[PDB]
Design a protein around this ligand. Structure first.
Ligand SMILES: Cc1cc2nc3c(=O)[nH]c(=O)nc-3n(C[C@H](O)[C@H](O)[C@H](O)COP(=O)(O)OP(=O)(O)OC[C@H]3O[C@@H](n4cnc5c(N)ncnc54)[C@H](O)[C@@H]3O)c2cc1C
Ligand SMILES: Cc1cc2nc3c(=O)[nH]c(=O)nc-3n(C[C@H](O)[C@H](O)[C@H](O)COP(=O)(O)OP(=O)(O)OC[C@H]3O[C@@H](n4cnc5c(N)ncnc54)[C@H](O)[C@@H]3O)c2cc1C
Ligand SMILES: CCCCCCCCCCCCO[C@@H]1O[C@H](CO)[C@@H](O[C@H]2O[C@H](CO)[C@@H](O)[C@H](O)[C@H]2O)[C@H](O)[C@H]1O
Ligand SMILES: CCCCCCCCCCCCO[C@@H]1O[C@H](CO)[C@@H](O[C@H]2O[C@H](CO)[C@@H](O)[C@H](O)[C@H]2O)[C@H](O)[C@H]1O
Ligand SMILES: [S]
Ligand SMILES: [S]
Ligand SMILES: [S]
Ligand SMILES: [S]
Ligand SMILES: [S]
Ligand SMILES: [S]
Ligand SMILES: [S]
Ligand SMILES: [S]
Ligand SMILES: [S]
Ligand SMILES: [S]
Lengths: 421, 421
């Protein structure tokens, strides 16, 4: 309302949950902050691959949101938004209620576009997914069904995927778990299928020696690997795969039987967001300026996977670049600062800063991690690392992030760089 | 929500508007206060009779609510509540949206029960009303239509009415206005019909010499007056009146032609409130204890005309006792204090205090006013007064109340008793 602007944060995930806390901290008691989300619980997404193989439980990685944000003065609505009217500034919720806003921060993350590949939906066939804890629990269930009745495995990433690390991670920990169960010798074939132009491209044109290390890792585990692949359909428990060359010409088609499968899908914008006329690119991603402000609506900001980031290369099979945690938090921090500035006269000048990708994957006793910045080579930092200490760091950061999500955040975030001082 | 209770005030009138301000003042920034009302504007009800004869305009007595309450941190919803679910603690609004509450203060005032008398609705016949500015504007319109085409006048109060002062006031100022227009001699008959057992009973068994003074005033103006009357129907521009004796036996029936009429209707509780199972008496009035708390729902409080107050006498024709401004404000003050106490552990002990009725009527250059307390005789104060100074006081208080409704209130209210100190 006038003088007491109402700020709504849409989506309670990696970006939106911190956004809610930071917004409330920044605005104070004279402004209403409402967090709206489809689920009533927060989940730590990077832990999902482990849920998918049974090394972790939902209880370990998820928790109910209400109490933690309410004790901070944040209103929580656990309903999905179905429609956004950007002119009227109303959000229509699944239950039919409407919520008005003065400022809206979109942090709705990705729509998992299973529909790109007929039959690929986890509920339609044997190809599962581990992007959400719901799906990872289901993937694990189906993994247990593979144990009771061994058959071919196919793991990888679909055309248009932007999140490749987890596919390699999941394949490695499955291979590992199979060994630790003396079941590995029971698998007739274990195949890795990716839309990447080469192993370890990772949607970022490789990082450090990702190519060599991931290639060797796959071979070490007896996983046969194909690149430049798209899946045209999943049907009758078979994946129909087309493999192309540098020019997009088919060089083979394959029909792969699948008893147990997991393919990272392409991401699009969620329907409620993509449905806002003029707000998004054709993929459903919100077009924002460097200050995280919508180019169309001055009172709509966005952060996280939900925003559009222009490609910098074109691969034989369409692929995207990942949007990862540190950059997401910088987007969030910039949006909150620039909204506050709008509320107080100024134009906020804060940006998300330099593009970067940072990923940590835990294999059990040790992990792999990379840091890449900026997006195009030659880079200022281009490191891939493997060690027991990556594992320790992943474990540490998970514990930390979950704690902060319960206790609240403010100021910036991360800056766990107190391990220097 | 937990730790930050949400308080909703239903109705933005004489009680509810101050309730919103006082609630927000009392609770502070850590609690949401939402004011919900059917109209987007406040109106000063006691001024309506003057609107009804054209001595005042809507612009003089009403103003839009939003800006004034919002600048105080109060959320304003200009929608009628249609349904209240006291179990779920949800209010369904006219537009279909729902509002949840932790505490609800009902200040919905009266439903004007025109349906008690078939044909009496201001839109169904010549019998108008002046309880709301919408209706008083309409009454005035019809008054102008009487000027252009003189015919019999009938003014008064229906069976079950509880608000008699305004009927006498309106009759006097009409008689007066007719004179000031040289139109008085054009009226074939001017009749006063009341459910009171005698002139000046006023629903409170008389006050001071109200009987004598009002009787004389009516005769002075050539107004013929009947008591112990109920109107059974209005039809074909005639009022069908039945007059009874002390025992309820008919002593005559009358059929009165009406060119211009105004009868104060009986009040009931509004449907959304009356519709709450177990909340109200059969009249639709909220049953509350001395702390203004609902006897059924510990988190519902009520103030103003909306609450039930037991009768203390029974008249040949049903009548009720008025609920007037000073007592309403005491109810409001008690409810706010006791809600705050609930929020902070204690049980609030504040009550509305002694029953009283206080009314001021302006006739033009001078006014009449009464004060009566407590409800049953013999009283501690039982005064009726007439003078130029009542007029000056009415004018002063109207200006004051409207100003306070724009600038906000807190602490108690009234206590304009600084004219002593
Ligand atoms: C398997 C996997 C592993 C990953 N590992 C890493 C990693 O190790 N390091 C790293 O930096 N990044 C990693 N990421 C990427 C990124 O950090 C996560 O995807 C992160 O969760 C993205 O944050 P987000 O806020 O944009 O979206 P999300 O965390 O997905 O949150 C979006 C929220 O919006 C809600 N929502 C969606 N639609 C609606 C709607 N219509 N109405 C209301 N709410 C809605 C969703 O329920 C969700 O709560 C990983 C991603 C995946 C999929
Ligand atoms: C003609 C007249 C003259 C009077 N003169 C005096 C006087 O001189 N002195 C005195 O002390 N008292 C006087 N009174 C009596 C009393 O003070 C007023 O009636 C006063 O307005 C009552 O206050 P209230 O808050 O209970 O109800 P109201 O002032 O009627 O307010 C009720 C509010 O609730 C709203 N509402 C109703 N239903 C809903 C719904 N379902 N959802 C949302 N909102 C709803 C209404 O729009 C209204 O805004 C007079 C009354 C009348 C009718
Ligand atoms: C985080 C994003 C990346 C994607 C997800 C994860 C992919 C899975 C990782 C596969 C790597 C496994 O293969 C592993 O690689 C490194 C080589 O560099 C080897 O390790 C070698 O370098 C490390 C240090 O980095 C030394 O400590 C070690 O003594 C040496 O042998 C391991 O002997 C080999 O087993
Ligand atoms: C407020 C609630 C009451 C209901 C609404 C109003 C009803 C209308 C009022 C009718 C009274 C008119 O009648 C009027 O009464 C008083 C008598 O007491 C007279 O006034 C008499 O007493 C007053 C003081 O009170 C003296 O100042 C005056 O000199 C004296 O004549 C007026 O000469 C007479 O004209
Ligand atoms: S998923
Ligand atoms: S990712
Ligand atoms: S990734
Ligand atoms: S990642
Ligand atoms: S590079
Ligand atoms: S009315
Ligand atoms: S009244
Ligand atoms: S009255
Ligand atoms: S009154
Ligand atoms: S009395």
């Amino acid at each position: 309302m006038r003088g007491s602007a109402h700020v709504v944060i849409l989506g309670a995930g990696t970006g939106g949950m911190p956004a809610a806390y930071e917004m409330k901290e920044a605005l104070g008691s004279g402004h209403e902050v409402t967090l709206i989300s489809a689920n009533d619980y927060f989940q730590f997404v990077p832990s999902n691959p482990w849920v998918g193989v049974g090394w972790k439980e939902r209880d370990d990685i998820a928790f109910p949101i209400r109490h933690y944000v309410e004790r901070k003065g944040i209103h929580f609505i656990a309903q999905s938004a179905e429609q956004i009217d950007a002119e009227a500034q109303n959000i229509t919720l699944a239950d039919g209620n409407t919520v008005h806003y003065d400022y809206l921060m979109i942090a709705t993350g990705p729509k998992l576009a299973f529909e790109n590949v007929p039959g690929s939906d986890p509920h339609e066939g044997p190809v599962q997914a581990i992007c959400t804890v719901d799906h990872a629990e289901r993937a694990f269930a189906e993994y247990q069904a593979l144990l009771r009745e061994p058959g071919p495995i196919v793991i990888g990433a679909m055309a248009g995927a932007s999140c490749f690390g987890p596919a390699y991670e999941y394949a490695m920990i499955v291979a590992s778990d199979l060994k630790k169960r003396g079941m590995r010798d029971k698998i007739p074939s274990f195949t890795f299928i990716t839309s990447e132009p080469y192993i370890g491209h990772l949607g970022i044109q490789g990082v450090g020696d990702s190519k060599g290390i991931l290639t060797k890792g796959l071979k070490e585990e007896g996983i046969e690997a194909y690149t430049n692949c798209k899946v045209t359909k999943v049907e009758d428990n078979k994946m129909y795969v087309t493999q192309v060359d540098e020019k997009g010409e088919t060089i083979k088609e394959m029909v792969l039987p699948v008893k147990f499968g997991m393919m990272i899908p392409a991401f699009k914008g969620v329907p409620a967001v993509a449905g806002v006329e003029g707000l998004c690119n054709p993929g459903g991603f919100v077009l924002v300026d460097e200050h995280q402000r919508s180019k169309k609506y001055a009172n709509i900001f966005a952060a996280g996977i939900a925003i559009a980031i222009p490609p910098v290369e074109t691969t034989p099979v369409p692929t995207g670049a990942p949007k990862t945690g540190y950059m997401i938090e910088s987007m969030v921090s910039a949006a909150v600062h620039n909204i506050k500035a709008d509320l107080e006269g100024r134009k906020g000048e804060q940006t998300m800063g330099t593009w970067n990708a940072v990923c940590f994957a835990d294999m059990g006793d040790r992990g792999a991690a990379f840091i890449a910045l900026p997006q195009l080579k030659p880079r200022k930092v281009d490191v891939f690392a493997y060690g027991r200490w990556v594992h320790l760091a992943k474990v540490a950061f998970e514990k930390y992030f979950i704690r902060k999500m319960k206790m609240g955040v403010s100021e910036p975030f991360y800056e766990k760089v107190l391990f220097k001082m």
